[PDB]
Structure 1
């Protein structure tokens, strides 16, 4: 039976799915014109960049 230790495997899967999704959240343009900070400071001035 390959699904015998699913209770334990779910743990390491959720812990991975918790961080992996947390990495994709960096692509989320939260009310911003870009999700990369270096692109903002390079395209806008500090007053409008902040």
Structure 2
């Protein structure tokens, strides 16, 4: 449950939904917000596996 709830976290992003980031930002900015979310989700998976 914790692992799935973390998907809704923004981690400092403009929005937690990748489709909103892609729809609202020009790619050079979308990549930054997406990378932020990638870091947040990847850290969540590493925490779960550990």
**TM-score category (smaller protein):** 0.5 to 0.7
Stretches of structure 2 lacking an aligned partner (at least 5 in a row)? 32-50
Runs ≥4 residues deviating over 4 A:
none
Please give the TM-score of this superposition, normalised by the length of structure 2.
0.58
Between the two proteins, the alignment pairs up a number of residues equal to 31
Q: Which has the higher contact order (CA 8 A, sep 6+)?
A: 2
Structure label with greater radius of gyration = 1
Please give the TM-score of this superposition, normalised by the length of structure 1.
0.58
